[PDB]
Structure formats: C-alpha cells, structure tokens
Amino acid sequence: NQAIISVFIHETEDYNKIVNTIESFFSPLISNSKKNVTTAQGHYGNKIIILEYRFDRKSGEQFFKIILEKIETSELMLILTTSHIDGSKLYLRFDKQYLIAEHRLVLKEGDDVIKCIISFNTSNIKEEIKKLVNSRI
C-alpha cells in the first residue's frame, strides 16, 4: 500500500555516512523511491535534517519484504511479540548506530532512529510475519 523511511540527522552525525548506508542497504529498490531532504533549525544555528524516502505501492510490499529478508529472526520475533501499530500502519524504529556501523537492523525505542512506516489495507497483520517467523525457524 505504501512505505516510508524517515530519519532526523543532527549536526554531530555524519549525514553522508547515513545516506549512503541507507541508500545502499535498501539498494536497489530505494533507487526507485522519492527522496526528500529538509533542514529545520532554531534561532541559534541549531540545524536538524529530515531525510525521507517514499515507496509507492509497487515498491511498498517489496520494501517490507526486503526488511524481512534482512532483519535477524531475533528482532523479527521481537516485532510480532509486539504496540508498533496505529491504524493500519506499522512503525518499525531501527537503530541508527547498528545500521551504519554493522549493517544490522536492530529495533530501538524513540524517534531518534531510522523509522520505517508500512501501511497495510488489511489489519490480520500478525499472521503473516508469524508464518514467516514460523517459517524461518
């Protein structure tokens, strides 16, 4: 139905390192997505960067799929085992450190993460990752 990647990058962070990591890790599907970069700031030179990637339906399912084929079973179960749902969209917040330092998807808490939001039009949702979690095992 649709998928979105969203990350807030700070001054102290290596913006390029993150971009390359993300565009590579999700390569080459992410090459077909709409990329957005925006910069916000306060009144005292405090800049935040908002990096986004939109996936249309065509690449939506394929984006979820690639996340499923990359995430370790441990973290996957940790998902099913779960509060990451609002409406029909699933919010998966990944650890920035782990992805750029070890190309590894490790769930993390909060908004200071690489956020992946998937939108379903079926709700039900569980059974599929379960069959996969179950399958992998």
PDB file of C-alpha atoms in Angstrom:
ATOM      1  CA  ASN A   1       0.000   0.000   0.000  1.00  0.00           C
ATOM      2  CA  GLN A   2       2.877   2.372   0.895  1.00  0.00           C
ATOM      3  CA  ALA A   3       6.173   2.577   2.819  1.00  0.00           C
ATOM      4  CA  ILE A   4       8.202   5.448   4.261  1.00  0.00           C
ATOM      5  CA  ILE A   5      11.678   5.866   5.686  1.00  0.00           C
ATOM      6  CA  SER A   6      12.240   8.840   7.992  1.00  0.00           C
ATOM      7  CA  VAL A   7      15.300   9.961   9.906  1.00  0.00           C
ATOM      8  CA  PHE A   8      16.314  13.129  11.718  1.00  0.00           C
ATOM      9  CA  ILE A   9      20.033  13.764  11.336  1.00  0.00           C
ATOM     10  CA  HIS A  10      21.923  16.029  13.730  1.00  0.00           C
ATOM     11  CA  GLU A  11      24.964  18.276  13.384  1.00  0.00           C
ATOM     12  CA  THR A  12      27.189  15.817  15.248  1.00  0.00           C
ATOM     13  CA  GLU A  13      26.069  12.983  12.968  1.00  0.00           C
ATOM     14  CA  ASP A  14      27.782  12.052   9.702  1.00  0.00           C
ATOM     15  CA  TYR A  15      24.957  12.837   7.290  1.00  0.00           C
ATOM     16  CA  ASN A  16      26.636  11.359   4.199  1.00  0.00           C
ATOM     17  CA  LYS A  17      27.634   8.182   6.001  1.00  0.00           C
ATOM     18  CA  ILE A  18      23.971   7.630   6.952  1.00  0.00           C
ATOM     19  CA  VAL A  19      22.593   8.449   3.478  1.00  0.00           C
ATOM     20  CA  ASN A  20      24.988   6.097   1.742  1.00  0.00           C
ATOM     21  CA  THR A  21      24.347   3.406   4.305  1.00  0.00           C
ATOM     22  CA  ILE A  22      20.586   3.684   3.850  1.00  0.00           C
ATOM     23  CA  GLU A  23      20.592   4.042   0.066  1.00  0.00           C
ATOM     24  CA  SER A  24      22.920   1.052  -0.148  1.00  0.00           C
ATOM     25  CA  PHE A  25      21.280  -1.170   2.444  1.00  0.00           C
ATOM     26  CA  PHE A  26      17.982  -0.802   0.571  1.00  0.00           C
ATOM     27  CA  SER A  27      19.608  -0.861  -2.826  1.00  0.00           C
ATOM     28  CA  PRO A  28      18.496  -1.025  -5.449  1.00  0.00           C
ATOM     29  CA  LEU A  29      14.799  -0.749  -4.615  1.00  0.00           C
ATOM     30  CA  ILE A  30      15.310   2.588  -2.839  1.00  0.00           C
ATOM     31  CA  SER A  31      16.678   3.959  -6.073  1.00  0.00           C
ATOM     32  CA  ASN A  32      13.102   3.965  -7.393  1.00  0.00           C
ATOM     33  CA  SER A  33      11.725   5.893  -4.423  1.00  0.00           C
ATOM     34  CA  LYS A  34      11.024   9.599  -3.941  1.00  0.00           C
ATOM     35  CA  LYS A  35      13.783  11.027  -1.747  1.00  0.00           C
ATOM     36  CA  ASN A  36      13.348  14.164   0.356  1.00  0.00           C
ATOM     37  CA  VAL A  37      15.795  16.163   2.418  1.00  0.00           C
ATOM     38  CA  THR A  38      14.660  19.154   4.509  1.00  0.00           C
ATOM     39  CA  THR A  39      16.524  21.264   7.053  1.00  0.00           C
ATOM     40  CA  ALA A  40      14.887  22.880  10.075  1.00  0.00           C
ATOM     41  CA  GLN A  41      16.615  24.959  12.772  1.00  0.00           C
ATOM     42  CA  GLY A  42      16.021  27.157  15.780  1.00  0.00           C
ATOM     43  CA  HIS A  43      17.041  30.780  16.173  1.00  0.00           C
ATOM     44  CA  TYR A  44      20.545  29.917  17.304  1.00  0.00           C
ATOM     45  CA  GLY A  45      22.067  27.925  14.468  1.00  0.00           C
ATOM     46  CA  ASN A  46      20.775  24.548  15.684  1.00  0.00           C
ATOM     47  CA  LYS A  47      20.122  22.541  12.475  1.00  0.00           C
ATOM     48  CA  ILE A  48      18.206  19.273  12.191  1.00  0.00           C
ATOM     49  CA  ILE A  49      17.975  17.397   8.883  1.00  0.00           C
ATOM     50  CA  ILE A  50      14.966  15.410   7.795  1.00  0.00           C
ATOM     51  CA  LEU A  51      15.697  12.654   5.329  1.00  0.00           C
ATOM     52  CA  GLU A  52      12.769  10.765   3.794  1.00  0.00           C
ATOM     53  CA  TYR A  53      12.122   8.067   1.213  1.00  0.00           C
ATOM     54  CA  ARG A  54       8.697   7.261  -0.110  1.00  0.00           C
ATOM     55  CA  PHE A  55       7.806   3.936  -1.671  1.00  0.00           C
ATOM     56  CA  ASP A  56       4.723   3.688  -3.862  1.00  0.00           C
ATOM     57  CA  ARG A  57       2.511   0.597  -3.705  1.00  0.00           C
ATOM     58  CA  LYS A  58       4.604  -1.055  -6.418  1.00  0.00           C
ATOM     59  CA  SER A  59       7.662  -0.915  -4.173  1.00  0.00           C
ATOM     60  CA  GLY A  60       5.753  -0.886  -0.899  1.00  0.00           C
ATOM     61  CA  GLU A  61       5.390  -4.629  -0.475  1.00  0.00           C
ATOM     62  CA  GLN A  62       8.885  -5.081  -1.875  1.00  0.00           C
ATOM     63  CA  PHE A  63      10.309  -2.714   0.767  1.00  0.00           C
ATOM     64  CA  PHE A  64       8.697  -4.588   3.636  1.00  0.00           C
ATOM     65  CA  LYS A  65       9.884  -7.793   2.026  1.00  0.00           C
ATOM     66  CA  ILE A  66      13.487  -6.603   1.854  1.00  0.00           C
ATOM     67  CA  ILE A  67      13.337  -5.562   5.529  1.00  0.00           C
ATOM     68  CA  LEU A  68      12.056  -9.047   6.356  1.00  0.00           C
ATOM     69  CA  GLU A  69      14.862 -10.669   4.388  1.00  0.00           C
ATOM     70  CA  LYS A  70      17.476  -8.599   6.182  1.00  0.00           C
ATOM     71  CA  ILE A  71      16.316  -8.487   9.780  1.00  0.00           C
ATOM     72  CA  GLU A  72      17.623 -11.213  12.108  1.00  0.00           C
ATOM     73  CA  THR A  73      14.995 -13.690  13.401  1.00  0.00           C
ATOM     74  CA  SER A  74      15.547 -12.494  16.962  1.00  0.00           C
ATOM     75  CA  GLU A  75      14.430  -8.912  16.218  1.00  0.00           C
ATOM     76  CA  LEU A  76      11.636 -10.197  13.936  1.00  0.00           C
ATOM     77  CA  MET A  77      10.032 -12.180  16.745  1.00  0.00           C
ATOM     78  CA  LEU A  78      10.538  -9.131  18.943  1.00  0.00           C
ATOM     79  CA  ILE A  79       8.275  -7.373  16.439  1.00  0.00           C
ATOM     80  CA  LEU A  80       5.499  -9.970  16.420  1.00  0.00           C
ATOM     81  CA  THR A  81       5.834 -10.175  20.180  1.00  0.00           C
ATOM     82  CA  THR A  82       4.544  -6.592  19.872  1.00  0.00           C
ATOM     83  CA  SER A  83       2.442  -1.512  20.210  1.00  0.00           C
ATOM     84  CA  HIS A  84       4.104  -0.694  16.871  1.00  0.00           C
ATOM     85  CA  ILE A  85       0.731  -0.259  15.250  1.00  0.00           C
ATOM     86  CA  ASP A  86      -1.509   2.755  14.861  1.00  0.00           C
ATOM     87  CA  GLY A  87      -4.427   2.498  12.488  1.00  0.00           C
ATOM     88  CA  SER A  88      -3.285   0.334   9.590  1.00  0.00           C
ATOM     89  CA  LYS A  89       0.361   1.382   9.559  1.00  0.00           C
ATOM     90  CA  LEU A  90       3.192  -0.440  11.321  1.00  0.00           C
ATOM     91  CA  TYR A  91       6.006   1.669  12.761  1.00  0.00           C
ATOM     92  CA  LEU A  92       9.382  -0.037  12.885  1.00  0.00           C
ATOM     93  CA  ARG A  93      12.059   2.111  14.518  1.00  0.00           C
ATOM     94  CA  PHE A  94      15.577   0.871  13.773  1.00  0.00           C
ATOM     95  CA  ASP A  95      18.868   1.727  15.475  1.00  0.00           C
ATOM     96  CA  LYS A  96      20.963   4.250  13.532  1.00  0.00           C
ATOM     97  CA  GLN A  97      24.212   3.113  15.186  1.00  0.00           C
ATOM     98  CA  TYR A  98      23.704  -0.559  14.353  1.00  0.00           C
ATOM     99  CA  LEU A  99      22.851   0.021  10.694  1.00  0.00           C
ATOM    100  CA  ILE A 100      25.703   2.377   9.819  1.00  0.00           C
ATOM    101  CA  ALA A 101      28.235   0.515  11.945  1.00  0.00           C
ATOM    102  CA  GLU A 102      27.210  -3.104  11.260  1.00  0.00           C
ATOM    103  CA  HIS A 103      24.570  -3.096   8.512  1.00  0.00           C
ATOM    104  CA  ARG A 104      22.206  -4.601  11.068  1.00  0.00           C
ATOM    105  CA  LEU A 105      18.540  -3.900  11.722  1.00  0.00           C
ATOM    106  CA  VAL A 106      18.042  -3.732  15.472  1.00  0.00           C
ATOM    107  CA  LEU A 107      14.786  -2.362  16.844  1.00  0.00           C
ATOM    108  CA  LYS A 108      15.225   0.678  19.095  1.00  0.00           C
ATOM    109  CA  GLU A 109      12.918   2.937  21.058  1.00  0.00           C
ATOM    110  CA  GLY A 110      12.081   6.561  20.445  1.00  0.00           C
ATOM    111  CA  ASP A 111      12.175   8.828  17.421  1.00  0.00           C
ATOM    112  CA  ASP A 112      15.945   9.255  17.156  1.00  0.00           C
ATOM    113  CA  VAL A 113      16.065   6.201  14.892  1.00  0.00           C
ATOM    114  CA  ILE A 114      15.749   5.215  11.231  1.00  0.00           C
ATOM    115  CA  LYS A 115      11.970   4.965  11.099  1.00  0.00           C
ATOM    116  CA  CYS A 116      10.237   2.616   8.667  1.00  0.00           C
ATOM    117  CA  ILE A 117       6.474   3.045   8.422  1.00  0.00           C
ATOM    118  CA  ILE A 118       4.475   0.468   6.473  1.00  0.00           C
ATOM    119  CA  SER A 119       0.815   0.935   5.561  1.00  0.00           C
ATOM    120  CA  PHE A 120      -1.439  -2.093   5.167  1.00  0.00           C
ATOM    121  CA  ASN A 121      -5.025  -2.228   3.996  1.00  0.00           C
ATOM    122  CA  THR A 122      -5.804  -5.494   5.760  1.00  0.00           C
ATOM    123  CA  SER A 123      -5.214  -5.132   9.536  1.00  0.00           C
ATOM    124  CA  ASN A 124      -4.650  -9.869  10.268  1.00  0.00           C
ATOM    125  CA  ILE A 125      -1.217  -8.253  10.019  1.00  0.00           C
ATOM    126  CA  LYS A 126       0.319 -10.596  12.616  1.00  0.00           C
ATOM    127  CA  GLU A 127      -0.329 -13.979  10.958  1.00  0.00           C
ATOM    128  CA  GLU A 128       1.927 -13.060   8.027  1.00  0.00           C
ATOM    129  CA  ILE A 129       5.086 -12.199   9.963  1.00  0.00           C
ATOM    130  CA  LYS A 130       4.205 -15.141  12.185  1.00  0.00           C
ATOM    131  CA  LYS A 131       4.083 -17.534   9.244  1.00  0.00           C
ATOM    132  CA  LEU A 132       7.437 -16.022   8.297  1.00  0.00           C
ATOM    133  CA  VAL A 133       8.862 -16.107  11.816  1.00  0.00           C
ATOM    134  CA  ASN A 134       7.482 -19.638  11.966  1.00  0.00           C
ATOM    135  CA  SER A 135       8.849 -20.389   8.505  1.00  0.00           C
ATOM    136  CA  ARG A 136      12.372 -19.194   9.225  1.00  0.00           C
ATOM    137  CA  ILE A 137      12.555 -21.419  12.294  1.00  0.00           C
TER     138      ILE A 137
END
